[PDB]
Amino acid sequence: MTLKELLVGFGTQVRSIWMIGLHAFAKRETRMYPEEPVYLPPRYRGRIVLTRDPDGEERC
Amino acid sequence: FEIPVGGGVSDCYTRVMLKVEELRQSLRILEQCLNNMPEGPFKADHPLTTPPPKERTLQHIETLITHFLQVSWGPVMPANESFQMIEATKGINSYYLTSDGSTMSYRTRVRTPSFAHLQQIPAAIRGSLVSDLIVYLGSIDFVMSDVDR
Amino acid sequence: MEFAFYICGLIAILATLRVITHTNPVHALLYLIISLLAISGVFFSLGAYFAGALEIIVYAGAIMVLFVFVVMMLNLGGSEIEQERQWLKPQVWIGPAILSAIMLVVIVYAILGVNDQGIDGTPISAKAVGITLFGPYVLAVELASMLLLAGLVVAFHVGREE
Amino acid sequence: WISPELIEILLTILKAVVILLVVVTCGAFMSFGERRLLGLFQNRYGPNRVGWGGSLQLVADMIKMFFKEDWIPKFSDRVIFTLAPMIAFTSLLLAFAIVPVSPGWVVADLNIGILFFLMMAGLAVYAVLFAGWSSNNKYSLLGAMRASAQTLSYEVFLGLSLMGVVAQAGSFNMTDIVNSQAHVWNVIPQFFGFITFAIAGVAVCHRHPFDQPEAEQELADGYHIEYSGMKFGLFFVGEYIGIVTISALMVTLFFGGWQGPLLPPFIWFALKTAFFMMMFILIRASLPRPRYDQVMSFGWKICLPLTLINLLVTAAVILWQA
Amino acid sequence: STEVIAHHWAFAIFLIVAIGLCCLMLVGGWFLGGRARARSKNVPFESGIDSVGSARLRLSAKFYLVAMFFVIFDVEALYLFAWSTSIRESGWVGFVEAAIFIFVLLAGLVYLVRIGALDWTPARSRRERMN
Amino acid sequence: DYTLTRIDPNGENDRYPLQKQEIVTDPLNVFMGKLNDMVNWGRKNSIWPYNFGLSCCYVEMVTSFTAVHDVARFGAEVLRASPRQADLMVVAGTCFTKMAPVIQRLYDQMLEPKWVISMGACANSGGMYDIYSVVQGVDKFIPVDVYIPGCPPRPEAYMQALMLLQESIGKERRPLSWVVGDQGVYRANMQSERERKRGERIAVTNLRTPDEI
Numbered sequence A: 001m002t003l004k005e006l007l008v009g010f011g012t013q014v015r016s017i018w019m020i021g022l023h024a025f026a027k028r029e030t031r032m033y034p035e036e037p038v039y040l041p042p043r044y045r046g047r048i049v050l051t052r053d054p055d056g057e058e059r060c
Numbered sequence B: 001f002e003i004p005v006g007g008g009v010s011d012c013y014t015r016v017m018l019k020v021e022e023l024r025q026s027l028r029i030l031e032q033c034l035n036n037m038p039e040g041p042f043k044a045d046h047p048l049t050t051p052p053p054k055e056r057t058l059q060h061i062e063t064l065i066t067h068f069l070q071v072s073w074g075p076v077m078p079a080n081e082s083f084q085m086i087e088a089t090k091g092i093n094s095y096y097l098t099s100d101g102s103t104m105s106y107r108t109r110v111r112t113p114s115f116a117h118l119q120q121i122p123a124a125i126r127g128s129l130v131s132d133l134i135v136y137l138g139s140i141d142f143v144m145s146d147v148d149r
Numbered sequence C: 001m002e003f004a005f006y007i008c009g010l011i012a013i014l015a016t017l018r019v020i021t022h023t024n025p026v027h028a029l030l031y032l033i034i035s036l037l038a039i040s041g042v043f044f045s046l047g048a049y050f051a052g053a054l055e056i057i058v059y060a061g062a063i064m065v066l067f068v069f070v071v072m073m074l075n076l077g078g079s080e081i082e083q084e085r086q087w088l089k090p091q092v093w094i095g096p097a098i099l100s101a102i103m104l105v106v107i108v109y110a111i112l113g114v115n116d117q118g119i120d121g122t123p124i125s126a127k128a129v130g131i132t133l134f135g136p137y138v139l140a141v142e143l144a145s146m147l148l149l150a151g152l153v154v155a156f157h158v159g160r161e162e
Numbered sequence D: 001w002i003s004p005e006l007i008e009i010l011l012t013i014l015k016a017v018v019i020l021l022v023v024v025t026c027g028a029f030m031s032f033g034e035r036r037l038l039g040l041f042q043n044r045y046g047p048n049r050v051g052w053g054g055s056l057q058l059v060a061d062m063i064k065m066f067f068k069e070d071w072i073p074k075f076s077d078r079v080i081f082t083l084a085p086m087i088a089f090t091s092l093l094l095a096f097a098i099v100p101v102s103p104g105w106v107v108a109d110l111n112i113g114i115l116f117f118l119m120m121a122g123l124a125v126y127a128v129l130f131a132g133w134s135s136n137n138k139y140s141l142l143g144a145m146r147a148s149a150q151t152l153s154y155e156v157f158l159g160l161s162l163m164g165v166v167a168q169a170g171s172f173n174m175t176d177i178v179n180s181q182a183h184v185w186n187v188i189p190q191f192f193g194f195i196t197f198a199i200a201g202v203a204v205c206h207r208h209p210f211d212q213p214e215a216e217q218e219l220a221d222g223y224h225i226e227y228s229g230m231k232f233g234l235f236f237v238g239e240y241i242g243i244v245t246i247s248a249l250m251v252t253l254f255f256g257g258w259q260g261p262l263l264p265p266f267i268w269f270a271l272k273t274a275f276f277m278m279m280f281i282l283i284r285a286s287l288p289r290p291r292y293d294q295v296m297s298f299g300w301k302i303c304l305p306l307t308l309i310n311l312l313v314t315a316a317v318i319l320w321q322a
Numbered sequence E: 001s002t003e004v005i006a007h008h009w010a011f012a013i014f015l016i017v018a019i020g021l022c023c024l025m026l027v028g029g030w031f032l033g034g035r036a037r038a039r040s041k042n043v044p045f046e047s048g049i050d051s052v053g054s055a056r057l058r059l060s061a062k063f064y065l066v067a068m069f070f071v072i073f074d075v076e077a078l079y080l081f082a083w084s085t086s087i088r089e090s091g092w093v094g095f096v097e098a099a100i101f102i103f104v105l106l107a108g109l110v111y112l113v114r115i116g117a118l119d120w121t122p123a124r125s126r127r128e129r130m131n
Numbered sequence F: 001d002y003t004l005t006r007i008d009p010n011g012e013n014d015r016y017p018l019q020k021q022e023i024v025t026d027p028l029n030v031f032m033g034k035l036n037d038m039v040n041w042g043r044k045n046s047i048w049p050y051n052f053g054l055s056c057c058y059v060e061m062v063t064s065f066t067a068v069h070d071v072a073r074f075g076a077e078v079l080r081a082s083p084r085q086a087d088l089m090v091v092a093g094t095c096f097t098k099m100a101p102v103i104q105r106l107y108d109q110m111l112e113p114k115w116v117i118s119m120g121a122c123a124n125s126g127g128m129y130d131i132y133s134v135v136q137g138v139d140k141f142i143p144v145d146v147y148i149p150g151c152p153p154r155p156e157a158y159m160q161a162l163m164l165l166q167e168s169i170g171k172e173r174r175p176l177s178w179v180v181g182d183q184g185v186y187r188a189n190m191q192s193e194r195e196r197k198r199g200e201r202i203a204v205t206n207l208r209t210p211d212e213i
């Protein structure tokens, strides 16, 4: 390899190390299940239920 | 939106950076989607729209009849052959559908791009190191559900 | 000091005897490693610290190359072990056994008559070896560089494919 | 048995035992520390539930590793298979035995010193070689061949990268090496020796980006595939002890060792060693893995001439100032 | 003296306790816990399907020439190791000797690089075809 | 309230799994129980999953490995590529008929102790793929410790199953050594999660309407 390629590669390695080391100062992105509950949007498709009418009888 | 193209050589690096540019172009399309979102129906006014709009199903009898038959026996597609080709995430994905006039497909042929890329693999990697093949597998953009259907 | 010398020499003798009469090549290389470590311990017991350090340093690399070549060629399971074991017979070793024994007897008889005041084991430093090496032995250093160059050229010319 | 000589002998023995126990504990707790620091570098937490802050995660891992089935395969060379983790555990521990962690705190004040470190590294390659060969696994044999290729890459210039520091100190002894850095640390004059020793010492421990014998993406963890239980744990505890030893040697040779203006000498030594341990973790987190033919080309065409020219320039400077 | 023999005893105890701790951890791993039994447990791992052949084969390494060259270059390195510990005593004459030695070393390295002795990459992995 | 499993790979039983299970009582004294609890604590707090995936469910499991979920917090991120170093097999994906001998071989190559989580509807029962080329559930031949419904289960569902496996491990009885003692594996017959959560689930009255975000 050329000398310029060696110096450029050294610089890019230094830059990669520097940016990950700066990620060490960043805010955490973790959503801490189960201590903080998972937010689910209202139409999220999970457990199936059978519901009742406003009069209290089963709708099915 | 722009379609990024390479310089003539399909490299691992060139494929990855082309997908990076495609990501930026999809961000542009999403910006246009956010800013210019039409007001109107989310379902077509066709009788074969499956299922019909739910509020009309819940209060109108003919809509309820259409919904009842569409979800149970199925919508009746008149006998024909249809094809749609799209730019999927990993290449060109296509559906070729044959209706025999029933509520089921007579033939559903799915063309997926990963099948072709995995068949291309031995021609493009022959005579290389194993590490080159690892990088090649990482740069193809395939999943095996696409390959085997 | 004498404890280390005698035990390391005994280990070197036993490991070398294990090397020359072994069938598995990787096991033979491990016993060669053990014998050279023991000879380095002998060197350390005599005050030749630089020689012992270089004994471990350059034979760890050299036997690594021997392992590379053994993996390239010799290791096949039990095929090379069966072939090598069939090559060793009682007659095949008993022939040169008395030859080596009488050579050792004559050399030992010549050794036992020499004047010996004992090796006090005073350490001869690596600095003193470096001073002698680049002092009175300058031509030895430069012509040894030429010797290693010749080894490089011979290895390149012979050990190629096409 | 009341004599000053004998009690000084047991004091030195106790100090050596304390050094050994602290180094082994630092290897295990730095397996845990690698997990936590990788979490820190990747905007997450790592193990922080088992005990306070995850401090009992190492204990749980040790219990799991002990009570895991520690097996020896029927297709493997059993003695060599068992011997390879022992080499991986012991070689760079013995290399640590020459590190002066404080004035008066060194296990072995050897006249050969850094030569003993080179001896232990040259012995340390055989752990991966024996593990790859003896396990009778195809991926493990490929890992062993890659490890030998790596050794060809770095061992040609590792000692030569240390030779500028040796030349400046005029001695192989490591206490003399830290005494020669009383005014200026060796990272300033021996900067090219420093970067070449950093490359070669990362390659000594088979740490990323030089983890080609154990390359997960290529060889599915390579040479230690058939290992399990405490033999696998022996391989990784030896790897972390090797990280500790290489970081401490880097501090000792290029960063003054224990010398510093205000703090106690062991505090300076521990701070600098902890910094380079963190740098091991950070380069594992930061940069990609080169191909091993590219690593061999880099070692033979760049690093080795750099070490030779560095030694020549260092000697010219030393003789000019003498 | 006394510090020297204290350090000798410390080195001996260091090595003994290190090897004994390794052996103790190996023994504790061996004896604790249960054991698994399976029909294909004692089959080498090759991603879940049987092997074609085994790992005992004539696997041709490509860097064997570099291995020979490594042995030679390590001996040259020890010559420089001997020089570097006594540079001030050898003076400028020793510097001239080591400069000639290092130049012959570097000329041999340049010769090896230029004749392709250090190249073993297959032609499809030389990365010639780029954009 | 314990099921005892004894394996017999060379016995007079051809159908997988090569084991026998019997409902027994808890075999558990003041020190053996404490040390068994310590072993269970260490095993449940250090669960190394096998890097093994069949389909989309694997994508959700490795999503749980990343920074936004950080399954490392539970000590289960180590993700071994070798079956010898892995403790947990997650069948994360469809048990394809062609892949079933491979799954059996990989399960055989794992060492004691080993646990199995069937992740997703395909691994649970075949899911939506009642089709010629798919085994209808990995528990047709692999003993399964935890089942996760979902297609795919979200990453926190995989984490919930990891906690369920932790509670099951924390009260199981395993041989402390292979030289002396009972070698069979005792697994506690837990109360079903459905019956445990029935009281709080049926009491739900109103949910948010699906019209807003």
Ligand SMILES: CCCCCCCCCCCCCCCCCC(=O)OC[C@H](COP(=O)(O)OCCN)OC(=O)CCCCCCCCCCCCCCCCC
Pocket (backbone or CB within 6 Å): A001, A005, A006, A007, A008, A009, A010, A013, A014, D195, D198, D199, D201, D202, D209, D246, D247, D250, D276, D279, D280, D283, D290, D291, D293, D294, D295, D296, D297, D298, E121, E125, E126, E127
């Ligand atoms: C206490 C010990 C631990 C200390 C921790 C801190 C230091 C860590 C050191 C990490 C060292 C990593 C070295 C990696 C070397 C990789 C060289 C290589 O093989 O690069 C390959 C690449 C392309 O290869 P090429 O030959 O061009 O292609 C031929 C294709 N057949 O070639 C290139 O990309 C060309 C450029 C190569 C650049 C090499 C790396 C430069 C030095 C390391 C990074 C900087 C570390 C900090 C240094 C001090 C900064 C003050």
Ligand SMILES: CCCCCCCCCCC1=C(C)C(=O)C(OC)=C(OC)C1=O
Pocket (backbone or CB within 6 Å): D028, D031, D032, D034, D035, D038, D061, D062, D065, D233, D236, D237, F077, F078, F079
């Ligand atoms: C005294 C015995 C203690 C044994 C403790 C062994 C712990 C090993 C963990 C090392 C490790 C492994 C294997 C590992 O595979 C890994 O993933 C790449 C890590 O980083 C997240 C690790 O830290």
Ligand SMILES: CCCCCCCCCCCCCCCCCCCC
Pocket (backbone or CB within 6 Å): C095, C096, C098, C099
């Ligand atoms: C197929 C060819 C094999 C060649 C093997 C050669 C082995 C030679 C062994 C010689 C043993 C000599 C034993 C001592 C003889 C008496 C002393 C020397 C002659 C006076």
Ligand SMILES: CCCCCCCCCCCCCCCCCCCC
Pocket (backbone or CB within 6 Å): D018, D019, D020, D022, D023, D026, D101, D102, D105, D244, D264, D265, D266, D267, D269, D270, D271, D273, D274
């Ligand atoms: C991360 C640092 C790792 C260091 C490993 C080696 C440490 C060995 C144990 C040293 C214990 C004694 C320290 C010096 C005592 C005298 C000074 C006390 C005040 C700092």
Ligand code: SF4
Pocket (backbone or CB within 6 Å): F054, F055, F056, F057, F092, F093, F094, F119, F120, F121, F122, F123, F127, F150, F151, F152, F153
């Ligand atoms: S259960 Fe659903 S998400 Fe999971 S593997 Fe099957 S199809 Fe994919």
